[PDB]
C-alpha cells in the first residue's frame, strides 16, 4: 500500500506561496496531516484532517487534499517557515505513515562554494600500516554537496566515507569525507583526488604519493 | 501546558534491550491514544507503535513487530516501550506523540516530545589514534596556513579538540564525526594560522576522550 511521496526540497522568495505536495493512491480518502520540524527540535503539527488548523498556528498556513495529492499552502512566506515539513496519514494497512519531507528554503543567505581542503597521510600513519584521504569542505552555501573521489582519473567507491552537511557558525555548512586505503594502494596510483560539487560546479583538490 | 518528556535512551549493543518511558502532563492522559515515532539521524519520521486510551488495542510498525512491547499506566500518567532484541537500524530519536484522539483511527500525532536518543551498536570502547595533517601548500608565504589533526576510530561519542591547551581557539574549525562502516567514528580538526609562523611557533592539539578515559597531545608540524 503506503507509500507517500514529497519533493525534497521547494524553494520561495519571502511573501511569495509556498507549495509543498504530499501524493499517494487515493490520498484524498485519508486525513491528511501536515509537521513542520526546525533542526534539533521536535515535529510541530501546523495542519491537521487536510485543513483544520489548530490555534497557535498563524493563518498563513492551508491544507487540500483531493485525489493523489495533498497540499500543504503557506502565504506570504516568512523566514521564520524554513523548516523540513512532512505529511502523515492513517490507514488500516500501514497505520501511521509519513512522507519522506520537504525542506523548505526561503532564498536566505547568497549562494558560497565550498572550500576544499585535501589532506594526504601522514608518515605517522603509513609507519603504523594504514592510510586515510581526509577531505574537508567548508563555507558553502546552500548545504548540499557531491563527493567523489579519483585514483589517478578512474573512479573509487572502495573506502569511501562522507558525513552529511551540518550547519556552521556563520550560516553555511562544513562536510567532511575520507577515503581509507592501505599503503601498496596508497603508492599503487600515482595521485587522488576529491572532487566536490555543490548546487552548480565542481572544486576538486589533488594528492600524489611521495 | 501539553508535555511529553522522553527518557531510558542510550547507548546499548545489538541483540540487547532496552525500556523508555514517557512521563505526560497538563491533558487528560488517559482518555487519548499515544504513540512512538522515531527519526534515524538525518532520515524521516517513523512510526514505531501506538496504543489506545483505554489499552484495548495496540499496534506497532512491521519492522518493529514481536520484538517491542508498549504499555501505558494511567495512573502515573506514563508511556512506556519495552525494546529486545535490538538491531542497529533501530538507531534514532524516539519520540512520545500524543494521538488527535483516543482510537486507533484518530492515532495520528499532535503533541510530540523532545525525544530521547538510542544508539544501538556493537562497537568496543575505543580512544582514538590521533595523527597530524601537516601544513602543505595551499595559499603562500605573508598567506595563511591550514594544518589539522585526524583523530581516527573512536567509540562512543563525544571527542573533544583543543589546540595548544585551549590557549588557540580563533582559527579553529572541528568537524563533525563521520560514522564508519566498522561503526567506529573518525573527525578531525583544522587550525588557520599565519604561513609565516610555520616552524617558529608551535602547534600540538589535545585531544580528549572520557569514555575510554584518553588523553592525546600531538604536535602538529610541517
Known amino acids: 500500500s503506503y507509500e507517500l511521496t514529497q519533493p525534497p526540497s521547494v524553494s520561495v522568495a519571502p511573501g511569495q506561496t509556498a507549495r509543498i505536495s504530499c501524493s499517494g493512491d487515493?490520498?484524498?480518502?485519508?486525513?491528511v496531516s501536515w509537521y513542520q520540524q526546525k533542526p534539533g527540535q521536535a515535529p510541530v503539527l501546523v495542519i491537521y484532517?487536510?485543513?483544520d488548523r489548530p490555534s497557535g498556528i498563524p493563518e498563513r498556513f492551508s491544507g487540500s487534499n483531493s485525489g493523489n495529492t495533498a497540499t500543504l499552502t503557506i502565504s506570504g512566506t516568512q523566514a521564520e517557515d524554513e523548516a523540513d515539513y512532512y505529511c502523515?496519514?492513517?490507514?488500516?494497512?500501514?497505520?501511521?505513515?509519513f512522507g519522506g519531507g520537504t525542506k523548505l528554503t526561503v532564498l536566505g543567505q547568497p549562494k558560497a562554494a565550498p572550500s576544499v581542503t585535501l589532506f594526504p597521510p601522514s608518515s605517522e600513519e603509513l609507519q603504523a600500516n594504514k592510510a586515510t584521504l581526509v577531505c574537508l569542505i567548508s563555507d558553502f552555501y546552500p548545504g548540499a554537496v557531491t563527493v567523489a573521489w579519483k585514483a589517478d582519473s578512474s573512479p573509487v567507491k572502495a573506502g569511501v566515507e562522507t558525513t552529511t552537511p551540518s550547519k556552521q557558525s556563520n550560516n553555511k555548512y562544513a562536510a567532511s569525507s575520507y577515503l581509507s586505503l592501505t599503503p601498496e594502494q596508497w603508492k599503487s596510483h600515482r595521485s587522488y583526488s576529491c572532487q566536490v560539487t555543490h548546487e552548480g560546479s565542481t572544486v576538486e583538490k589533488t594528492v600524489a604519493p611521495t | 501546558q501539553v508535555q511529553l518528556v522522553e527518557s531510558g535512551g542510550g547507548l546499548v549493543q545489538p541483540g540487547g534491550s532496552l525500556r523508555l518511558s514517557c512521563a505526560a502532563s497538563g491533558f487528560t492522559f488517559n482518555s487519548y491514544w499515544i504513540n512512538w515515532v522515531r527519526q534515524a539521524p538525518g532520515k524521516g519520521l517513523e512510526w514505531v507503535s501506538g496504543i489506545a486510551y483505554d489499552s484495548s488495542n495496540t499496534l506497532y510498525a512491521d519492522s518493529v513487530k514481536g520484538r517491542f512491547t508498549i504499555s501505558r499506566d494511567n495512573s502515573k500518567n506514563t508511556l512506556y516501550l519495552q525494546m529486545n532484541s535490538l538491531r542497529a537500524e533501530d538507531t534514532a530519536v524516539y519520540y512520545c506523540?500524543?494521538?488527535?484522539?483516543?482510537?486507533?483511527?484518530?492515532?495520528?500525532?499532535?503533541?510530540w516530545g523532545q525525544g530521547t536518543l538510542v544508539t544501538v551498536s556493537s562497537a568496543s570502547t575505543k580512544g582514538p589514534s590521533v595523527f597530524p595533517l601537516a601544513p602543505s601548500s595551499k595559499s603562500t608565504s605573508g598567506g595563511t596556513a591550514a594544518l589539522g589533526c585526524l583523530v581516527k576510530d573512536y567509540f562512543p561519542e563525544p571527542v573533544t579538540v583543543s589546540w595548544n591547551s585551549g590557549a588557540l581557539t580563533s582559527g579553529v574549525h572541528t568537524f563533525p564525526a563521520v560514522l564508519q562502516s566498522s561503526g567506529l567514528y573518525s573527525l578531525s580538526s583544522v587550525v588557520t594560522v599565519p604561513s609565516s609562523s610555520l616552524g617558529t611557533q608551535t602547534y600540538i592539539c589535545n585531544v580528549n576522550h572520557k569514555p575510554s578515559n584518553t588523553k592525546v597531545d600531538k604536535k602538529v608540524e610541517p
Open positions: 484532517d487536510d485543513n
Open positions: 487515493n490520498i484524498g480518502g485519508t486525513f
Open positions: 506523540a500524543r494521538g488527535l484522539g483516543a482510537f486507533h483511527w484518530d492515532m495520528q500525532p499532535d503533541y
Open positions: 502523515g496519514t492513517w490507514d488500516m494497512v500501514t497505520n501511521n505513515v
